[PDB]
Symmetry: D3
Subunit: 156 residues, 6 copies
């Protein structure tokens, strides 16, 4: 049983770690799949985001980190994945998540989207919020893996 957890992960946060950890407790193999996402003009290059996520998930034996620029549904088919994991924080996210999941189902009917709920601890954070605080030199050590925090400090 192979699951894909796709996203921009710009950068990967403790919220993302929480979701991928939950996914590994449920599925045999989890592919953490980092989308290139040029339209979002990411802070970190795809190569940097992949390296950060690889380092942050090395303790989890059944996580494979990969980058992709393809249509997500095509990438999931090409990874032999039948489960698509997404984290569900709030209502505003849920509605866009429904659109994406219905589109993905149209593109690959056998790829089942599943939503996981993060810990209360990470229910109010996002990569965007963490970057905004860090741009103003605010302490974000609590929200990121150590290697990501260092990389964000170094980047800024």
């Amino acid at each position: 049983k192979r699951a894909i957890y796709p996203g921009t992960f710009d950068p990967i946060t403790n919220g993302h770690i929480d979701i991928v950890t939950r996914a590994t407790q449920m599925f045999d193999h989890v592919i953490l799949a980092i989308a290139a996402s040029p339209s979002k003009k990411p802070m970190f290059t795809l190569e940097e985001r992949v390296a950060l996520a690889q380092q942050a998930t090395a303790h989890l034996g059944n996580v494979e980190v990969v980058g992709f620029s393809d249509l997500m549904a095509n990438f999931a088919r090409n990874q032999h994945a039948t489960v698509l994991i997404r984290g569900l924080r709030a209502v505003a996210d849920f509605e866009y998540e429904m659109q994406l999941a219905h589109m993905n189902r149209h593109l690959m009917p056998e790829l089942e989207s599943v939503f996981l709920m993060p810990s209360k601890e990470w229910s109010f954070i996002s990569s965007s919020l963490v970057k905004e605080v860090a741009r103003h030199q605010g302490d974000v050590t609590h929200f990121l893996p150590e290697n990501v925090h260092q990389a964000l400090m170094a980047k800024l």
Copy 2:
């Protein structure tokens, strides 16, 4: 991984929306328990025995589905059944805040039980057992939303 999943609800009665969710759950988990609550607080249209028999008949074609009634706190039942996955259907019209409250409470009660949210087909994304019953009680056509055995049982229930 030999995962056991539970899909709890009142299933009063079981709809095509519930069939769609339980079908999707069987494609990703080895064993799925469709767990029917006594749900005395709501005062159900169908008795637990009727709800169980309707659900067994409607899911008989799915080999890895077990239909079972329960009267305890769902988390207590999931624990006793050795389930590690809790299936929740998320319709386009679901109370998202309530689902969050429920999942956090279930996680407090049984941390080893993971809540997983599945999405039904667009076809069943706007219905509920509640709306189906209300429409049928008021002489509306609900055949499209139900398994054939459920349609027959509901017609018989409303006739008396």
Copy 3:
């Protein structure tokens, strides 16, 4: 086009918010039926006869409004009345998901009936018959939210 529109609800009692919606509906459709549900499930404060008389008096100045009671599934009543438009008021505080469920169910029941959502004035965007009744029962001033005849009827109802 000689469009017939229906504006259903419990109108228990009719408020300035309902008057605002029905007024807007008369400006765009030739004939508007303000359709009052028996709504026995909720157990209304005012009887159907009281609700109808209050609504007739409050809408008498609108020439193309017909106030009518109904006990069937609203879609069944809209079909029998040859209505092709179903008016729903959408307040800033409406249950959007419920409105979607209702409109899709109404479309399944009668495809030729189009649900149209109208927006009330900002003035009435945060009230409901439910909140108005609760406030009045608890000795609060609701005069501002009601037609004068409704204010008089509600005071008389609460006095006994």
Copy 4:
């Protein structure tokens, strides 16, 4: 400014979420009245006398908190108590539209009373007295969500 604030609710029973909100309110307002509604419509698990005593004991460490029962429209009670601030707790799972309806209605009733929304700790952002009671009635562990005196009272209530 010698501000008097009111924090109304049914507190059936008072939870750690309510304690968190009332604590935050005492840090910004000089006097906080924790106002317990008779709330007969809901039919509460605990009587008003039980709810008041539980809340007094759970807030005794907060010097500027006064626990008081009330049976009038909350706005009528706030007016008589010379309160100019109305505390509302806003959980991650609150009915935002309902809070808006309530605040606008309270502003219509008493314009000099300002509704202020406080946010509880992430720890209590997904609970309610309703969910806590439901879980406890169904043999679930709710100790974590309640003050110790409330936990003892709830166990005694459910035992009989």
Copy 5:
């Protein structure tokens, strides 16, 4: 009775077709009004969007397609329209729709905003989502009129 259905329509989708068709069953004349929308940096020029919508709605006799750069309320007044149609997909859209409708009411009190609900089939699609899938070469034939699909393929 004249109704205006305004939007960016970048490009027009089957969801938009569904709404305009419903609008023609209710009102005598429907103006499908395409806003220039430079702030949104559209994929298609106004002239292209107008031509695509004209071709896509030619089967509906009481639809007139027009482009505009004016304040929408002024354009509706200038078209003698008294009805403003908008499609209502989800909660997140509904709130911004309320702001726009209350502003339009302030600008032109007699222009009544009316919301129509799309078919379940088109309830999870948007021009943005279709463009995102098409940018990654994903199949969008199901969501667009034939002429629009060809034009989107040709544009990309």
Copy 6:
């Protein structure tokens, strides 16, 4: 008792005036704090936004208008503020407001976020909406203080 009311205020609207007025009826001193917000690419410079807000709030004796480029939580600590005011218009705003308030609480636990509800009159307006209408020469006199309206007319 010192409260801070932070925001981009690009430009300050009658909705913002309504909130700051409510805040002064509750707290002894209110700092209306204008964030530089370069990421939002504001129409008005920080100096212009500060001057507009100063003029618009001069009638309120206990309002101090200040600009800032710092982390908001650091600025609140540096202003000796213990209350953070935000206006709550709708559901979509509420969710992002929760994230910001939980982050601010992590950065400064003693700074209490409080939400105030605007008048029905201003419940559907925003700086963005007012600028959009004004860009198309629509009448926005009703939504802005006189000095702001003149400045917006002059800017456009």
